[PDB]
Ligand binder design. Structure first.
Ligand SMILES: *[C@@H]1O[C@H](CO)[C@@H](O[C@@H]2O[C@H](CO)[C@@H](O)[C@H](O)[C@H]2NC(C)=O)[C@H](O)[C@H]1NC(C)=O
Ligand SMILES: *[C@@H]1O[C@H](CO)[C@@H](O[C@@H]2O[C@H](CO)[C@@H](O)[C@H](O)[C@H]2NC(C)=O)[C@H](O)[C@H]1NC(C)=O
Lengths: 49, 44, 44
């Protein structure tokens, strides 16, 4: 993830300094989708029909 | 960058081809904590 | 790298624009057998 965010154009200073918040952001991003398992997920709509 | 049993060396991305490290195949990057500090056999 | 008729020079890859060689349009590279060994007018 460090090298991929290097690849998008983010400097190594903030990656060296801001690991915890981006880790929490990624973790809560992957945790929010479990409760989103409903009609709002267009992927479930496509699977369903 | 690579180690071998005959100090580091270089290999390409698609073949195990050991050869001594040059500036023609490396670039300068700001330091990161994950790296390896060396103080005995400095490459050119 | 393009010969001139008023000696090598630089040209772009999509237009015939002869231009003297600088450091900003070339890169260092390992030698090959097919390269030209010029020894009377060294490029900068
Ligand atoms: C190589 O030396 C550098 C310089 O001291 C080390 O970088 C620091 O390492 C400490 C802990 O090892 C960290 O708390 C600092 O944040 C690091 N600073 C920077 C600017 O990177 C590096 O860890 C050393 N590497 C090895 C393998 O010993
Ligand atoms: C320019 O000089 C180089 C150095 O001798 C020539 O490259 C060598 O060419 C011989 C001829 O087959 C090869 O056996 C060597 O392996 C080559 N050396 C390297 C390092 O590749 C090159 O041929 C010369 N250029 C011209 C146009 O004659």
């Amino acid at each position: 993830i460090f090298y991929r965010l290097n690849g998008v154009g983010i400097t190594q200073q903030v990656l060296s300094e801001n690991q915890k918040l981006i880790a929490n952001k990624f973790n809560q991003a992957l945790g929010a989708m479990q409760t989103g398992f409903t009609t709002t997920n267009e992927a479930f709509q496509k699977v369903q029909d | 960058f690579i180690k071998t049993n005959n100090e580091w060396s270089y290999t390409g991305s698609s073949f195990y081809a050991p050869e001594p490290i040059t500036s023609l195949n490396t670039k300068y990057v700001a330091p990161q904590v994950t790296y390896q500090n060396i103080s005995t056999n400095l490459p050119p």
